[PDB]
Amino acid sequence: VTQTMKGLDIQKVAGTWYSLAMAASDISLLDAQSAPLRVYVEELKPTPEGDLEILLQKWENGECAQKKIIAEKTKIPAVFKIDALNENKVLVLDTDYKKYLLACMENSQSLACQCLVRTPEVDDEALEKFDKALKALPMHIRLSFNPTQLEEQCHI
Amino acid sequence: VTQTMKGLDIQKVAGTWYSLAMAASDISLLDAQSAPLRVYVEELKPTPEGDLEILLQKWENGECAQKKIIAEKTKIPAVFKIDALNENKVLVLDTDYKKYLLACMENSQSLACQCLVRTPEVDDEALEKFDKALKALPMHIRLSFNPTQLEEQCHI
Ligand SMILES: CCCCCCCCCCCC(=O)O
Ligand SMILES: CCCCCCCCCCCC(=O)O
């Protein structure tokens, strides 16, 4: 990923988001309801220090579970770290704060990206920006959700 | 689907094909390795009468199985019928016979389409034609395969 948001203000991505679309480099990352990167964003909570708390849902061991993860800031405003055994990066590609946000997670390559939107509607303009960003990346699975699904736990 | 191949010669689609890409209206049709429309074309066998025999593979009850289905001709050269409990149509959107073929199956709507190619290579021109045909259709999952996967049973 060589598309980052110039001039990102992380405080202004705060609040409610919907995972309208998702893509990944490997089918197995998004294939099943319980695939490892099939995660649905609920809320972004930037910290005063400029870290990013992410509230999401995931189908795990038979049901829809809530998880909270923190992505720590780096020297680059558009790039956060979630490290454990593995060094992983969260990248903000593009946002207008009020309607859409494009982001990817990548390892150290495998990756997964999402088109986030503020409301349970299909934003054709946001999806066209997402597809343009992906034309640069080696994606092998793409999913998108309808407005009914966007209002359900785990997009059921 | 309102894109059919004008002037189709069904005899000239005979022989070896590879399921390079697949798309469908509903995630659940293609999501799992064993999802109902996750089928890999091996061979097209037009009959002297102008019916279409389709040899394909599918992951069913734990393994990669061979199936043969016949799609019966209609009054329209680009449209075949596979009926059982349900009336389903196979539509040929576009082909150049020697490199790529675009086809969909639809019910009576849910649908699934494939980009078929003659060789285990990523044909960017065929994929751009597939994406152009899909921009007309309500697809929510898209998969594509690499050349290593294209040479394995059930694209493992
Ligand atoms: C800016 C944060 C956007 C959240 C989605 C990141 C990209 C998809 C991968 C999600 C997986 C995870 O965060 O564990
Ligand atoms: C011209 C035949 C092409 C074969 C693929 C048809 C479209 C995808 C759906 C396959 C499912 C099936 O044929 O049972």
UniProtKB/Swiss-Prot annotation, chains A, B:
The keyword Thylakoid does not apply. Its main location: secreted. GO terms for molecular function: identical protein binding; long-chain fatty acid binding; retinol binding. GO terms for cellular component: extracellular region. It is found in: Secreted. Keywords: Allergen, Disulfide bond, Milk protein, Retinol-binding, Secreted, Signal, Transport. The keyword Chaperone does not apply. Disulfide bonds join 64-154, 104-113, 104-115. Alternate disulfide bonds occur in equal amounts in all variants examined. Synthesized in mammary gland and secreted in milk. It comes from the Eukaryota. Under physiological conditions beta-lactoglobulin exists as an equilibrium mixture of monomeric and dimeric forms. Interaction with LMBR1L which mediates the endocytosis of LGB has been observed in PubMed:17991420, but not in PubMed:23964685. Belongs to the calycin superfamily. Lipocalin family. Primary component of whey, it binds retinol and is probably involved in the transport of that molecule. This is Beta-lactoglobulin.
